[PDB]
Design a protein around this ligand. Structure first.
Ligand code: 0J4
Ligand code: 0J4
Lengths: 252, 252
């Protein structure tokens, strides 16, 4: 039981009633195609919209946040690691930050987070696979992200963790991170799991990307059962139903 | 780790390498439509074909077992509780018995099992929902099926258990049986979970029977993670992929 609510400016996310679904989002053609998708996702049971060099990243992602935040009543996270991109995106209307490098590629991003008082997702990442002991190094690695974030003024309650499935991990190390996901819980934070349609599901099932829906389901179910608060997925309709059935069962 | 193989006459089922999928099966039109389905199921990753008053039950189910056992190289279980039906069906070519009353409606069925030396599935069932303590009563109830079976000469290794999801249980008691499935393990037997498309998935998701595929997935994943050796499903293709992803993850 979490004794607090995820505070996202306009919207508030309760961490106890259900698994929160974060749906992944793909001029006028671009921004409209994006709005249709957010609306669809919003309608299929999504609770959050995730919207993915420096000059161009802003020119592409800012227009989308303006449009989607205006027409879809749901918190928006900006899928970046660059400090400037993150600032611009929160100004444009993004509620959450989602950094795939856990404040380590550009430490100043954390200072953006503390500044605007927004929730931040620190994902596990690194430039090698040379682990002593996978889980233990992960936990040490994520904790290093927490220290960078805390030193920057980010409040405990605006911190979210993500084990970084599919990053800096071999096919077999990804299964291992899955199998030991509950250990992440000892750190005392909400956990977002992002496994959708990823390579390692292909490697187990020997299936191409468009046929990984049942594989993704598996990983989502396993992760909810191991205590995750969020899941980041492509197939919002399917995964929402799966999440809700899980939640019924574990008694959430 | 099971230190023995499920022995089914012609075929042998290993209990350690993977989750075994049992696929549910629906004159010339009848028996041919049935054969197409078994073949399809066999091709989608099924490991076992499950084939569902006394006079007519034999006339309908015997022809199917003859045909399917001849054209599909996979063990067949007969989904009955009647003693005579079970005998006739094993003569017709059925390898396993699947009793939904756990030897309690017709105790003589167990004697059929001991006689032909075939594996038997004892499912939990009863004519009321008046539980003191759900799980505990289940375990006591199933154990009563084991005592009837053992007294009849059924060998420990030919015994399989099934918690009886959807039987004699309220919507909320079914979620509870799911949430506590691992307790069944203490009895020392293989466990078959059968939740496919059932009413309680409808009650949680508020979805009709043809839209319960993601709900069923959830229950299958939860059950594998809680140590089940079999799952009995309609949607063989989808559930096989889900099972295999689970198995990769739990390290099975
Ligand atoms: C790799 C990419 C993707 O959608 O596959 C991705 N981007 N951002 C991501 N952010 C987080 N927090 N987690 C992810 O798994 C993840 C991704 O998998
Ligand atoms: C009720 C029916 C069905 O397919 O839904 C059924 N028949 N036989 C069954 N046998 C076993 N061992 N388990 C079941 O859940 C089960 C069923 O659910």
């Amino acid at each position: 039981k979490w004794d607090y609510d995820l505070r996202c400016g306009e919207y508030t996310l309760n961490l106890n009633e259900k698994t929160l679904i974060m749906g992944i989002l793909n001029s006028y053609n671009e921004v409209d195609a994006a709005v249709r998708h957010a609306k669809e996702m919003r309608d299929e049971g999504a609770h959050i919209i995730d919207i993915g060099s420096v000059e161009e990243e802003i020119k592409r992602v800012v227009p989308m946040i303006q449009a989607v935040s205006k027409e879809v009543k749901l918190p928006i996270s900006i899928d970046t690691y660059k400090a400037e991109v993150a600032k611009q995106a929160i100004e444009a209307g993004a509620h959450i930050i989602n950094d795939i490098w856990g404040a380590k590629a550009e430490p100043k991003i954390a200072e953006v987070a503390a500044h605007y008082d927004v929730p931040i997702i620190l994902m596990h990442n690194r430039d090698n696979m040379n682990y002593r002991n996978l889980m233990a190094d992960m936990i040490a690695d994520l904790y290093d992200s927490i220290k960078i974030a805390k030193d920057a003024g980010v409040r405990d309650e605006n911190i979210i963790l993500d084990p970084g499935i599919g990053f800096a991990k071999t096919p077999e190390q990804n299964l291992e991170a899955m199998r030991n996901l509950e250990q992440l819980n000892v750190l005392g934070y909400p956990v977002l799991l992002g496994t959708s349609r990823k390579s390692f599901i292909g490697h187990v099932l020997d299936l191409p990307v468009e046929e990984r829906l049942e594989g993704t389901g598996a990983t989502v179910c396993l992760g909810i059962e191991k205590g995750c608060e969020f899941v980041r997925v492509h197939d919002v309709k399917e995964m929402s139903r799966m999440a809700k059935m899980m939640d019924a069962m574990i008694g959430k």
